[PDB]
């Protein structure tokens, strides 16, 4: 068949690209040293490095390492410092939030103090990383879209861990640090407050998540299908329209009756992705503080379905009949 442009047929390699610079003097803080990986060169660029070292990046790295080490050493001490049993039960361990009886007060190290210290370090690390992503775009003389979309996810992060426990008045409302233990928190949160399906903001969040995955499938396929016209060079197509953009627009116009531009599709993508954590955080913040049972709320607002048939197995079959006796 025709070439489909999924893996590159042949690779070429030249001198390493050290990057652009301006009066801001970015070269001062950049590391020296690059590598080439031929395995990842089949799908994308092969060059590895260099990287930018600032104050925000170093602070974020140190605080994140501290948070990781605190969680890990607590998990190790919880098992008796036995390494084989630490490995055997890795997915089941966690560092647990404090008990409900302490409110917002500082608990003992045995019953949530380490949890609070680790949470403080993680918060510092994430905020420092956001500051770094803002500063880099400021020094490159570009727009601030990356920082604003990272801030939309940080909103749901903060609502889950900081704002809602303060509004409810207890640090015991936060999420435990563990793999199976945080999936237990998700299910228990859904059960405790009725049914999270009947939360309209959870439904809006699902709408936007599904839509973003659908949009990425569409955009990736469309750009790969017009690459024979040089379609992957999107910026030059924005500055000087070519036949790739026209064919890409006309496909969707003839398919569903309307289309986009080469620059306008990225606005659609940016909004569908960012709208997911915003609606999610609004939905989470309203639970427990305003609404305590979402199914009863749905019954009150008349969008809960009604069923006529009966419940129980004896209305449909017999115990002997199921067993085959």
């Amino acid at each position: 068949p025709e070439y489909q442009n999924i893996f590159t047929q042949v690779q070429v390699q030249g001198p390493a690209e050290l990057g652009v610079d301006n009066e801001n003097n970015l070269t001062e803080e950049r590391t020296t040293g690059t590598g080439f990986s031929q395995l990842i060169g089949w799908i994308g660029n092969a060059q590895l490095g260099p990287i930018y070292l600032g104050w925000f990046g170093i602070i974020s790295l140190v605080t994140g390492t501290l948070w990781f080490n605190i969680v890990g050493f607590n998990m190790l001490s919880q098992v008796g410092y036995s390494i084989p049993e630490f490995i055997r039960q890795l997915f089941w361990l966690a560092l647990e939030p404090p008990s409900p009886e302490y409110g917002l007060r500082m608990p003992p190290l045995d019953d949530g103090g380490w949890f609070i210290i680790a949470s403080f370090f993680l918060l510092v690390s994430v905020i420092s990383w956001w500051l770094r992503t803002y500063q880099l775009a400021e020094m490159h003389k570009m727009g601030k879209h990356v920082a604003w979309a990272f801030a939309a996810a940080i909103w749901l992060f903060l609502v889950l861990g900081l704002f809602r426990p303060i509004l409810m008045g207890s640090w015991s409302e936060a999420v435990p640090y563990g793999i199976f233990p945080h999936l237990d928190w998700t299910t228990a949160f859904s059960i405790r407050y009725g049914n999270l399906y009947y939360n309209p903001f959870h439904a809006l969040s699902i709408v936007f998540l599904y839509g973003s995955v659908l949009l990425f499938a569409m955009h990736g396929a469309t750009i790969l299908a017009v690459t024979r016209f040089g379609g992957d060079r999107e910026l030059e197509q924005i500055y000087d329209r070519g036949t790739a953009s026209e064919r890409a627009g006309l496909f969707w116009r003839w398919t569903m009756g309307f289309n986009a531009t080469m620059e306008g599709i990225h606005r659609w993508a940016w909004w569908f992705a960012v709208l997911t954590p915003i609606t999610g955080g609004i939905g989470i913040l309203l639970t427990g503080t305003v609404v305590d049972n979402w199914f009863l709320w749905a019954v009150e607002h008349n969008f809960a379905p009604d069923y006529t048939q009966d419940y129980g197995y004896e209305a449909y079959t017999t115990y002997d009949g199921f067993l085959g006796r």
């Binding site: 690779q11 030249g14 089949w42 809006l204 024979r228 016209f229 036949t243 531009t261 909004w271 309203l286």
Partner: protein, 255 residues
């Protein structure tokens, strides 16, 4: 919690506010996507009586690099074609057009090109972005099969020449074009093929879109060291038009 009236609480107010915001956002997003290709026309070239539910946006300005000036959109369609060898097949709207002469040579249908600028695309240094490998310092093949020297196979199974060079993108470290040297029986000079229409094997290179007799009419570059945007559009459109116009059986129904 209490209700202002009936069942109206904070959740309902938040929901209605989000509904209003989403309506405004949908309006903005649809309007931002109407900066190219408007207003609409009928099949005879005149402005259509219907223009839609959404009004046209206001103007925005870009500032280009390397001293190319400004671009304000929406504006006049500067990429428009002048004389198209096409004919109508009905007196009304909604029916296909029929080529007048040779669609592959006239640039209509899937062989269409757009009128881009007659200058090469530049990198950050201000040099032409796409360069032949013979004039790129320190570049070489690092993986895969080197296609230089291998023969080229046409879509009908004819050998037309040999691969003589590759044109690479220095900034992004990627191969963009393959350069061929035509045999005297199949034309004269050198031609370019985009990397996205070829398959490199251990003993040959295969091009399936066009036939052996179509290789002498591929558009040529003006200079042996660079290619402009118009030339690229004209070359890639030619190669893509053969997927429908190379053979009569490729156009008629397959069933």
């Amino acid at each position: 919690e209490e209700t202002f009236f009936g069942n109206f609480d904070l959740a309902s107010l938040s929901l209605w506010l989000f509904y209003g915001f989403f309506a405004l956002l949908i309006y903005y997003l649809q309007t931002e996507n109407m900066r190219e290709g408007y207003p609409l026309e009928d099949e005879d070239g005149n402005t259509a009586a219907n223009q839609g539910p959404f009004p046209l946006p206001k103007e925005k300005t870009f500032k280009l690099q390397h001293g190319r000036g400004e671009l304000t959109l929406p504006g006049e369609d500067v990429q428009r074609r002048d004389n198209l060898a096409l004919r109508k097949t009905a007196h009304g709207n909604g029916f296909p057009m029929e080529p007048t002469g040779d669609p592959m040579l006239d640039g209509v249908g899937p062989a269409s090109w757009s009128k881009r600028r007659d200058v090469p695309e530049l990198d950050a240094h201000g040099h032409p972005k796409i360069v032949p490998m013979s004039a790129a310092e320190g570049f070489g093949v690092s993986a895969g099969t080197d296609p230089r020297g291998l023969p080229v196979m046409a879509g009908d199974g004819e050998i037309v020449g040999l691969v003589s060079d590759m044109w690479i993108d220095e900034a992004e470290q990627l191969v963009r074009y393959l350069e061929l040297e035509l045999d005297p029986e199949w034309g004269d000079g050198k031609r370019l093929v985009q990397r996205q229409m070829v398959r490199i094997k251990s003993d040959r290179v295969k091009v399936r879109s066009i036939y052996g007799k179509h290789f002498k009419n591929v558009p040529k570059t003006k200079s042996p060291n660079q290619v402009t945007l118009l030339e690229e559009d004209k070359i890639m459109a030619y190669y893509a038009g053969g997927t429908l116009y190379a053979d009569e059986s490729r156009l008629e129904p397959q069933l």
